[PDB]
Write a protein that binds this ligand. Structure first.
Ligand SMILES: C[As](C)(=O)[O-]
Ligand SMILES: C[As](C)(=O)[O-]
Ligand SMILES: [Zn+2]
Ligand SMILES: [Zn+2]
Ligand SMILES: [Zn+2]
Ligand SMILES: [Zn+2]
Ligand SMILES: [Zn+2]
Ligand SMILES: [Zn+2]
Ligand SMILES: [Zn+2]
Ligand SMILES: [Zn+2]
Ligand SMILES: [Zn+2]
Ligand SMILES: [Zn+2]
Ligand SMILES: [Zn+2]
Lengths: 331, 330
């Protein structure tokens, strides 16, 4: 662990700089962007949109994003490579499986899924030689028998390579506790694991208990809010009705409890989003015109106004991501 | 119609010759061959295996196969074009959706799905310019709401372009009756539609009722049998416990009832199969070493011996597929 894999190759830990640890270029399904690009206008329109976004996030000080799109969330690593190069923003690619595995994945054993995740980390994604730098996994409430396999394989791959694991939860159902249990059953260090979408709970003790055990806490979808458009059931279900300030104040909460070193922050933004209702992207872009810049432009200043030391903010946005992304084998 | 689109471009209707109407190069999931080729040993190994198979089918008289792998069933049209060229066998590619749509498909409207099926027929698949020549759709028992949409969009695409529709059914549940109802509600001619996997029933009345209405009946997985592998639960679920001769006798039954013109026959073979249990391809290749050559090598002489005139067998394996695949507007 002296280098972090990106879609442009390895970078040093110090090169990562300000890092958004949970983002997407395009939330889709495997093959979908290749087969139906006109769903996004065109592939070129999507790329141009991504580059404009990335460039504006760069302007606000973002140096690196971690794209946590998996194979079943439509990751297209050649698009990532293209936009990373055009925008001059580092991108870290993911392996793992998210909430929508097709049959060829759902039927696999824990050993098979381990070999798959290892392939994407060690050999590269598809025929690109681009090596994943993180492993994304998911539950939404109690794990399905298959999701149990996925978590165990992610733990096995992370123990082998040192690359971290980062998760989708339903935070209101306290999924992080079962995920931690399964990870620890495989002997994974909690410091290898980010329990994501954790900004969906106001249950502060659920977060503090996990932080105290060494887990990273992903407060990773701060701009998500349907305040102002709650008639729209599909957007409400996705964005929630808690304000961005509510989400952002959990960062301050965990800091105030002594866990500044356990916090990772992100927007969870995307430039295309086919795996939900049509035009959800337009709805989201009107909610948060800053897009991926929302963290530096809105959240960091808000927290400083609320008294959080800038140096603590820097620890959260630079140190924590570098420590987490640094591949780290156990002793 | 006057041309059938293949992965190598348009062929004339006479050029199709002996045609297997329900096959696969690789039964997989979208993206899966590109992301994890080592599941199949390697892409190279899978291709070499397909080329061997296709060349042996060609030796047995197969000129054309229809690969009914959709987007969600792992179709990789570049693979198809590669092996079609190497083996010198015409391959017709499909659009549609089979039984494993991802979210980005499952969440779509009938109008959106229609546009996607049209793109693959009219434009091309992915960035390849390879145009589909058939639309595959699926139910397994009563149609879900999304499946209604898929069938309606298939019907609308077939009415627009004239390319046929072919189906997966659970024949035990008489899915062809609902499929037909849907297709007819959209105004699609039955002669544009093959009701597939129909060799899984023994209810000849179900089949004749469809054949009478002008549907094509796809007796399409003749070599599928788990007789002798009763201990293998997953193989038995897939293959069934009826023999190949029992499946093949349905062809003669339909001929005898007067419906030779409604019958399409195939193996439903594959060279890779990731969308099922591990090693299912090894189990199936043991059951049926002939692979896609099974129809010409075993089935056609079996029927000949039972009394079926060779002219009849030729009408089934050449004339019917030509009439089906010929794009035909209302
Ligand atoms: C692709 As998501 C809304 O689970 O971060
Ligand atoms: C890929 As199949 C077994 O539905 O023909
Ligand atoms: Zn750099
Ligand atoms: Zn998520
Ligand atoms: Zn949420
Ligand atoms: Zn996400
Ligand atoms: Zn300070
Ligand atoms: Zn030819
Ligand atoms: Zn089928
Ligand atoms: Zn069957
Ligand atoms: Zn009956
Ligand atoms: Zn099939
Ligand atoms: Zn004769």
């Amino acid at each position: 662990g002296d280098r972090i894999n990106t879609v442009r190759g390895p970078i040093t830990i110090s090169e990562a700089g300000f890092t958004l640890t949970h983002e997407h270029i395009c939330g889709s399904s495997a093959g979908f962007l290749r087969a139906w690009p006109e769903f996004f206008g065109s592939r070129k329109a999507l790329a141009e949109k991504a580059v404009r976004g990335l460039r504006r996030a760069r302007a606000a000080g973002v140096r690196t994003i971690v794209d946590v799109s998996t194979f079943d969330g439509g990751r297209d690593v050649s698009l990532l490579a293209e936009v990373s190069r055009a925008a001059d923003v580092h991108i870290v690619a993911a392996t793992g499986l998210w909430g929508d595995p097709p049959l060829s994945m759902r039927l696999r054993s824990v050993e098979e899924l381990t070999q798959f995740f290892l392939r994407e980390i060690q050999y590269g994604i598809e025929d690109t030689g681009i090596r994943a730098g993180i492993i994304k996994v998911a539950t939404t409430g109690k794990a399905t028998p298959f999701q149990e396999l996925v978590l165990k394989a992610a733990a096995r791959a992370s123990l082998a390579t040192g690359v971290p694991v980062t998760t989708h939860t339903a935070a209101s159902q306290r999924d992080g506790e079962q995920q931690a249990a399964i990870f620890e059953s495989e002997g994974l260090s909690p410091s290898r694991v980010c329990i994501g979408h954790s900004d969906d709970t106001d249950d502060l003790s659920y977060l503090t208990a996990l932080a105290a055990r060494g887990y990273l806490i992903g407060l990773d979808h701060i701009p998500y809010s349907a305040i102002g458009l709650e008639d729209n059931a599909s957007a409400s279900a996705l964005l929630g009705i808690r304000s961005w300030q509510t989400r952002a104040l959990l960062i301050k909460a965990l800091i105030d409890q002594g866990y500044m070193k356990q916090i990772l922050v992100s927007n969870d933004w995307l430039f295309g989003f086919s795996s939900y209702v049509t035009n959800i992207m337009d709805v989201m872009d009107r909610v948060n015109p800053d897009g991926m810049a929302f963290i530096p432009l809105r959240v960091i200043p808000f927290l400083r106004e609320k008294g959080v030391p800038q140096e603590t903010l820097a620890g959260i946005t630079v140190t924590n991501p570098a420590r987490f992304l640094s591949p780290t084998l156990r002793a």
